[PDB]
């Protein structure tokens, strides 16, 4: 670590999480594809508050839904916004992405392709879990602190 | 938990299809012309972190298995002290070392996981 | 007074052990193996391919050990003399042929294992042994060839007819494989190998499952093999693989399998699919379909059956391999341990002597066939065997 | 392959292997090992269906998921509900002698399988049977002083024999495969329902499951090592 | 020393408690995995650290004891053949066996030998040899010590072969 910062167990940890490669697959609990046709009202209860809350200051009826885990989330210093805006900045305009906020009790990401839908999705689901880099450097896997 | 169905006539796998007018989910057959409405909207599920498999092996004769360990704890149901117990039957590296017990009187499955998160253990 | 129902003590163990060695000695592995051959395995080989297009072979008799003398009577041969005289402690092998026209007999020599039922020392008393110049302390699980004492070291090898799933190196496109190396116990041990491979690794699009049949130049999707076997509906097939309806994870794993077999919807198209991957381009449909039926009947899981009406037996077994293969890819079971001794096997005198003796009895059988085609109008090379073994 | 595996216990010597190249690839059989010679499975396969083994021909999984599947020498012959009583009978037949001792029968309760082996080449050793068909106390070895008396009587007369012990269900032959399903006690004394500080430190008998007992632990050794005095006080190599 | 041997037995007994606790801990699911490590991985780690700490402290108690008359100690003090580890394995605990850097593995399904119950991760099960060579090893201890022994024989053959070609 940089000269004037070698006793900071706190910075060590920061740099650790900024090096240790982290994919979406390392933070995801499970993924599901639903038939949820009305981009306004949802067939999923828990997601009502999230589609509402996204109207303050094209899309296929098929929904890819990921459930993320807080432990791994806050552990690897990651924000719902970071994760989401990273996925978004990956699939061009070729994908509609929305996500619950850091306050909600459930971390969720919803995605719609933007007809062979069901198929492209299971492929996109794959690219997301393995290829997208949320944080870290390629190839660097474990990363440990020692004194 | 996507429990899927088969055709009524030709008994083949059904595939999800969209009724674009009333916006609902169907399941057609690609052999005959059969087609039905969907039970739930869930069409696919992928559990990166799973639980199923942990209890595999709980059989009626499990008590007669001599290689299994025995304890005398109490089961949350019949308080009978006749138990047989094993660790997670999944074979993943990232598993815990929690124990699963089987009441040999009422065959109830309980656990030593103080963070017990599930209700059925299946 | 010494209650005969009183528990046994640690010291009492040696009594049970002395009893063990009094009856078996120290080389029962050798004796027993060789005896099972000479007493059963031998006769069984004489009944396999024992008929020619007739001449059929029947019963076999085995002589006590003796020598072929140059300028003299056939002498009784004892081990001591065979060692000194650089001889071979063998015995006469006589068969019983049934010559019948269609459109005893001496046959080779068998080297005999000392102290086996056949040897002259097996029934010898202590003094009989001394007068014979054979130490009463000798154990005898060996042979005497050209005067030198020879031992057949046990050969350890993997057991046959056993399913085994294995993971695979990150490079290869096949993430898992379920293998069985079927082989018939008797007759002719045809080790045709069946492999059920799972294409694609965790995170690859549509992980498919294909099997490798013998004489077929392309891995075949499993759904197609099930239909070639008479199990047509997806429903019926999955049931042969997944014996639990709630296991949605496993059934999900086969979804791409079903799709990979869609084109084929009936038994004949399934058989033709296969027949074409094992036939040249100018062969006729029937011939093809026939080729595939014969393959699934004799080259496919031969340890189960080689007859006809047993396609449900092979379907369920094939389903069982697929089951265990997925049980591993689903991280519910660990890949099999290739080093578990319970799945190994040790070949000894008998089994070993049975590979050579089969192979040789089959060459003695070819020759006898070349004594008919070439005969437009007793022609038996006994040495074919006496040399093969001896060698 | 050249590593000393857990399943080698009692079947192959843990010490006698050569140095260098052949190390771990050339092995030696333990004093009491034997290798199966081979037997016909017909009678067993016949008896199996005579005892309720539903043919695989008429088996419907979605209809009887609990069913235990039975194999014989690798072949799946069928299914059987309530395998418990069949296994009891199977063990009794082999312990009488009606089923050749050499035959190996394994039931995996949790795995829902019953595998039988009749082929040659299988390595096995003998153990004391520890069934609890005795009332007076608890689980005990079936060999009692009276038996040993007969054994030693026959010795002195140089007719109760090793085969006698086998026939009267007192001892059994066990291969690595079957070994998986049992629980073996080291010293018969441990089935027992201020300590010598000079003795070595041994573990405790927390068992009521015992199914067998080692005739004597020193029999895991082969011929060469059986000649080393106090081998248990030496460094392994 | 008679009392020393007692200080040694207790030292090991104290090790088996620390191990027993971490087990109950793990079984209740209270152990926290160390970053970039599995529950099971860090569990094993602590158990092995405990078991070596034991062999070692057990060994020091024996070393200190021995008088200056003790011939083994006389040889060690001079520099001619000898070392702590030797006195430790002969007089006090022999220690934990191991193959491929880990404790003895479950070669049979979920157990090291048919003599144990399934899912037994205790020290006696997975290969800790409690006795010294003087006391003698139990049969299970003996087999485990032979598993570990074979390892050294195998790669001693390797190290040998590989080094001869590297040198040339
Ligand atoms: Zn249909
Ligand atoms: Zn209960």
Swiss-Prot record, chain B:
A zinc finger (TFIIS-type) spans 71-111. The keyword Nucleotide-binding does not apply. Zn(2+) 2 binds at residues 75, 78, 103, 106. GO terms for cellular component: nucleolus; nucleus; RNA polymerase II, core complex. The keyword DNA damage applies. Keywords: DNA damage, DNA repair, DNA-directed RNA polymerase, Metal-binding, Nucleus, Phosphoprotein, Transcription, Zinc, Zinc-finger. Zn(2+) 1 binds at residues 7, 10, 29, 32. Gene3D superfamilies: 2.20.25.10. A zinc finger (C4-type) spans 7-32. Present with 2440 molecules/cell in log phase SD medium. DNA-dependent RNA polymerase catalyzes the transcription of DNA into RNA using the four ribonucleoside triphosphates as substrates. Component of RNA polymerase II which synthesizes mRNA precursors and many functional non-coding RNAs. Pol II is the central component of the basal RNA polymerase II transcription machinery. It is composed of mobile elements that move relative to each other. RPB9 is part of the upper jaw surrounding the central large cleft and thought to grab the incoming DNA template. Involved in the regulation of transcription elongation. Belongs to the archaeal RpoM/eukaryotic RPA12/RPB9/RPC11 RNA polymerase family. This is DNA-directed RNA polymerase II subunit RPB9. It comes from Saccharomyces cerevisiae (strain ATCC 204508 / S288c) (Baker's yeast).
UniProtKB/Swiss-Prot annotation, chain D:
It is found in: Nucleus. It comes from the Eukaryota. The binding of ribonucleoside triphosphate to the RNA polymerase II transcribing complex probably involves a two-step mechanism. The initial binding seems to occur at the entry (E) site and involves a magnesium ion coordinated by three conserved aspartate residues of the two largest RNA Pol II subunits. Belongs to the RNA polymerase beta chain family. DNA-dependent RNA polymerase catalyzes the transcription of DNA into RNA using the four ribonucleoside triphosphates as substrates. Second largest component of RNA polymerases II which synthesizes mRNA precursors and many functional non-coding RNAs. Proposed to contribute to the polymerase catalytic activity and forms the polymerase active center together with the largest subunit. Pol II is the central component of the basal RNA polymerase II transcription machinery. Component of the RNA polymerase II (Pol II) complex consisting of 12 subunits. This is DNA-directed RNA polymerase II subunit RPB2. It comes from Saccharomyces cerevisiae (strain ATCC 204508 / S288c) (Baker's yeast). The lineage of its organism: Eukaryota, Fungi, Dikarya, Ascomycota, Saccharomycotina. The gene is RPB2. The chain holds residues 511 to 765 of 1224 of the full protein.
UniProtKB/Swiss-Prot annotation, chain E:
The tandem 7 residues repeats in the C-terminal domain (CTD) can be highly phosphorylated. The phosphorylation activates Pol II. Phosphorylation occurs mainly at residues 'Ser-2' and 'Ser-5' of the heptapeptide repeat. The phosphorylated form of Pol II appears to carry, on average, one phosphate per repeat. The phosphorylation state is believed to result from the balanced action of site-specific CTD kinases and phosphatases, and a 'CTD code' that specifies the position of Pol II within the transcription cycle has been proposed. It is found in: Nucleus. Residues 139-151 are annotated as: Bridging helix. There is a cross-link at residue 24 (Glycyl lysine isopeptide (Lys-Gly) (interchain with G-Cter in ubiquitin)). Component of the RNA polymerase II (Pol II) complex consisting of 12 subunits. Interacts with DEF1; the interaction is direct and serves to bridge RPB1 to the Elongin complex in a DNA-damaged dependent manner. Interacts with the Elongin subunit ELA1. Interacts with the Elongin subunit ELC1. Interacts with ASK10. Interacts with ESS1. Interacts with RTT103. Interacts with SHE2. DNA-dependent RNA polymerase catalyzes the transcription of DNA into RNA using the four ribonucleoside triphosphates as substrates. Largest and catalytic component of RNA polymerase II which synthesizes mRNA precursors and many functional non-coding RNAs. Forms the polymerase active center together with the second largest subunit. Pol II is the central component of the basal RNA polymerase II transcription machinery. During a transcription cycle, Pol II, general transcription factors and the Mediator complex assemble as the preinitiation complex (PIC) at the promoter. The C-terminal domain (CTD) serves as a platform for assembly of factors that regulate transcription initiation, elongation, termination and mRNA processing.
